[model samples]
Target: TMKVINDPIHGHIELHPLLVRIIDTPQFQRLRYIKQLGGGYYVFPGASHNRFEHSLGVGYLAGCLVHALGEKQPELQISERDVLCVQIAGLCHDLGHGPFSHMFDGRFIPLARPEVKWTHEQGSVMMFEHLINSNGIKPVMEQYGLIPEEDICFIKEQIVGPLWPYKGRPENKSFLYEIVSNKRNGIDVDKWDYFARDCHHLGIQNNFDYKRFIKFARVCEVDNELRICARDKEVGNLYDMFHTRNSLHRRAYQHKVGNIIDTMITDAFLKADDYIEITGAGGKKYRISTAIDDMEAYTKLTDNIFLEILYSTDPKLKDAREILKQIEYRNLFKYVGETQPTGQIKIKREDYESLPKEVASAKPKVLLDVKLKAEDFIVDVINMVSFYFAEQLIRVYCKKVDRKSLYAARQYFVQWCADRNF
Candidate 1:
């Protein structure tokens, strides 16, 4: 039986029976609580959507793209099995995402455990294995005409990619990898869904239309490798897609307010990491940072951890609880302007740490006359935005919220940038 879900972004999406069974699992259902934009909801209250629907949108969009390619070019020999695998890939691609999604890995894990180079992509694969194995979905997958031996590998590959020497789907069918996450051009259904869905929530204008791109998508032989190619007429549409991404990033994802909120939430997690414990299989307990190692424990972790700490009466979580209360009271850090350099400037963390005193020593009473401390400042070395070039923008923030302190911090930051001549 097909499952029809009416989504705000994608409208009515009829899911496959196999997909429904997978979605019914507790592990997959956990996505319902994981916020799509991480800490963005704090800044943009309307942006309260979760990963559950976003994954559904990506899965639906994945099916749409693959089906379109098959119907238009019969010679490509796209199969029903391929479409199903790609849809599942897009569906479960974000399954490994922890509590606040990227912050749990991007910000939290790096600080909590600097030893491990952990990513949600790696977690996705591990969770996918746990999902398929622990849920008894293998027999169901076989009943649905999917060869688990080959199809499962292909699905995981689409989520994270295949190994060298070419294992999963043959090298000729390499275009499938680009469908979910395009390493070649950074365009795929994943970006397609988020651009539309995120802009819808953020109330930003989106000029990119993915429908036109799907209509003209064709598989062509490029450099002896079969790759997904777009027609010359749709070239302008492709540029608009990335432009929409940059627009969303600037307006919503990379908003200064949201970034500081993310930092605050991360600080709370770091404080609560050792105190908070999630119970997994066999009644074993895992902390916030260690939960990533176990899917059962990680599945129970969500943005609800924010409330878990806030509402707890435990004395151990007092430090963590106070941070969340600060957020609720809107007592946030002051944002000094960021520097827009031409290209990425190699400013070390040591240099950023010593920046306040660097300015203070240069002029004994000008910047340090009021309130400027290295511990009270946040140096966000932003290197994530831009489509064409990787530009590094250094953003300074004062932990103290006093007007006089903010003014001094801003001047110090301004002088800091002026010295660079950027």
Candidate 2:
């Protein structure tokens, strides 16, 4: 039986019988608990959306784009089954995203490097394969005669790409892999859907034209490789797609407050004793990868788990707990001044030195932790990437400045430091 799913971005998405069966699986159902924007809820109150809804939205857009492209360019040879596979792939793209979304991914887990640790995409692929074998997805595949012994193997490979163990014909690449995997230069359904969906959630008006973009999507050979392109009236919609993504990053995604909180949570996870405790605490200190997968991480965690852990009453954790409690209750360290010269500089080290002996001798606390350096404190690439993209857009498109001016402005206005030693 088919399932009808109507989405605000893309209306009337029809799910195939096998796809519906897969959606009913526990692996797919777990997406409900996973927040799409991770800690973004702090900035946009309504942005506490979960992957379940976002995945559905991705599926709808994926289906629409695939159907439209297939109709326009039958030479691309995309089949109905292929379309469903891509939609399913889109729905499950973030299946391995941890409890706090990118918050967890940013810490502990390393997606790119082989030496760092677990890749979330690999974990997602593992869970999906596990679902097919352990859950009832196997039966549905058999019903559709999709149960070629190699199909599951292919699906997993395509969705996860080089991150997972996919073995088949050398030429045999997964359909979902093409549309969902993070191969460079390939725009996936996951991103296309999220930009539109997140913009709507945050009430940002710069999102793409989901309807027109899908309608005009056609596969064409670009430099000898096929890529999805928008034709005719939808050409500007394609630009909207990229620009909307650029705008969201500049305005909301890279909001300074969001970066601060995200950095805090990421630091907490990286400093977790569990990794040290499990892998022995001292000596040469070889990195120990978490044996637990990301889905396990997501399943075991909740929004308040960090706060709860941080504020535990246990004597050993009391100090950290107090700090966590303070943060939980919004007792954030007062902003003295951003380490940039552009922002108003209120507190100078010389000024502090000039204070009365008694005032100067008072023990520094919270925001006064002068020993911590921002470079050392903020080790995650998430914040770096956000700042990079935001600066790029602001300098190029927003300010319309030249190379020299932009470079000078970056150093003067955008440069941030966690600490400044007088």
Task: Pick out the ten consecutive residues of candidate 1 with the lowest summed lDDT.
Answer: 359-368
The whole-model C-alpha lDDT of candidate 2 against the native structure comes to 0.54
The positional error of residue 324 in candidate 2, measured at the CA in angstroms, is 2.8
lDDT of 1 by residue, 1-422 (tens): 87778987777999898889999989898888888888888788788889889899889988998898889889888889999899999999998888777777666776566567777898999999998999999999899899999998888888885445547777768878888988766878888788888888878888998887776677877756677777877767777777778877887778788889888787778878778778988999998888877788888888788888999997989988988989899988777676775264575423533554565433323535585555566666566611116766666666788877777766776565667566
Error of 2 at 390 (Å): 10
Best by TM-score: 1
Question: What is the C-alpha lDDT profile of model 2 across 121-201, one tens digit per residue?
Answer: 877787776666666676766666564476665666666765335563233223335555557654667787677677778
lDDT of model 2 at position 326:
55
* Backbone Cα, N, C clashes tallied per candidate: 0, 2
The 0-to-1 C-alpha lDDT of every candidate, in the order given, reads: 0.79, 0.54
RMSD of each: 3.7, 10.7
